[PDB]
């Protein structure tokens, strides 16, 4: 495949009633989850979620566990800090979210890096594309930005995003290449559902595909149509692949005018489906 990403997602939820925040971390390469940590799980370790990460040795798992536990403690502190910055009661539960990662492009070299942080589901602070400056959403985040500028946090992050992140993404892509570098083109078909004596629904299905990115469009006589159509959100099958469908309502007898066009990284040219079975 021809661009790739590695991304880590972190969520902490405060528990004002009793105890520490709930903390859940997940890591992905592309659309494949490969590690988890859950503060409520018994292991208290970073755990594998893909077979190709299992071959990493104990030093890896120890280091990744140490990092992820330290991160959890940082969010525990942050939840207290943020409640103060926003003059909020101790009584309510609040949420921190962080996502960071890096992309390699078509030339297999660094393409971009990112790091975004949110409080209660809204943007808080984010690293800009240049990996040198921060976007702060409000005056609480502006306090964090000044802090982080003075501590050279961006320089440290940038070194990671351009260096270790890219290097380890490439390592995972090779070690897991049998799946990570396999494209699964959608398995496509159409179904037909009479809605009345005069109209019918055509439903264009895309199944068992990877990666998740896909485009389904309908055309009538070779022109895109969005009126009288419905598209569902791309959804996981549960086996690592994805599903989607798009539907159009048409005058009974005129089905053959309509075409469903399917674009996906696994397809050298887009597919075109037509009800003429």
């Amino acid at each position: 495949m021809g661009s790739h990403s590695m991304r880590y997602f972190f969520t902490s939820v405060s528990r004002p009633g009793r105890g520490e925040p709930r903390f859940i971390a997940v890591g992905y390469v592309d659309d494949t989850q490969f590690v988890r940590f859950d503060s409520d799980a018994a292991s208290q370790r970073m755990e594998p979620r893909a077979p190709w990460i299992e071959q990493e040795g104990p030093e890896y798992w120890d280091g990744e566990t140490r990092k992820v536990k330290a991160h959890s403690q940082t969010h525990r502190v942050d939840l207290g800090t943020l409640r103060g910055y926003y003059n909020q009661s101790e009584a309510g539960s609040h949420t921190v979210q962080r996502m960071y990662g890096c992309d390699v492009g078509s030339d297999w070299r660094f393409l971009r890096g990112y790091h975004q942080y949110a409080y209660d589901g809204k943007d808080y602070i984010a690293l800009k594309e240049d990996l040198r400056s921060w976007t702060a959403a409000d005056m609480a985040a502006q306090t964090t930005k000044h802090k982080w500028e003075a501590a050279h946090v961006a320089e440290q992050l940038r070194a990671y995003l351009e260096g270790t992140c890219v290097e380890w993404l490439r390592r995972y892509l090779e070690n897991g290449k049998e799946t990570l570098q396999r494209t699964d083109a959608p398995k496509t078909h159409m179904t037909h559902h009479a809605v009345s004596d005069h109209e019918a629904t055509l439903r264009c299905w895309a199944l068992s595909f990877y990666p998740a990115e896909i485009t389904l469009t309908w055309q009538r006589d070779g022109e895109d149509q969005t009126q009288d159509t419905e598209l569902v959100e791309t959804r996981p099958a549960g086996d690592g692949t994805f599903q989607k469908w798009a539907a159009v309502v048409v005058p009974s007898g005129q089905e053959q005018r309509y075409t469903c066009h399917v674009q996906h990284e696994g397809l050298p040219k887009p597919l075109t489906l037509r009800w003429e079975p």
């Binding site: 880590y8 890591g27 890896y60 280091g63 990744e64 140490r66 990092k67 992820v68 330290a70 991160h71 403690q73 940082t74 502190v77 942050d78 800090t81 943020l82 962080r98 960071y100 942080y117 808080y124 602070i125 985040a141 964090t144 802090k147 982080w148 501590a151 946090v153 992050l157 990671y160 995003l161 270790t164 992140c165 380890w168």
Partner: peptide, 10 residues
């Protein structure tokens, strides 16, 4: 591989 050793606090 995660960013380490530990993110800066807000």
């Amino acid at each position: 591989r995660q960013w380490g050793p530990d993110p800066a606090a807000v």
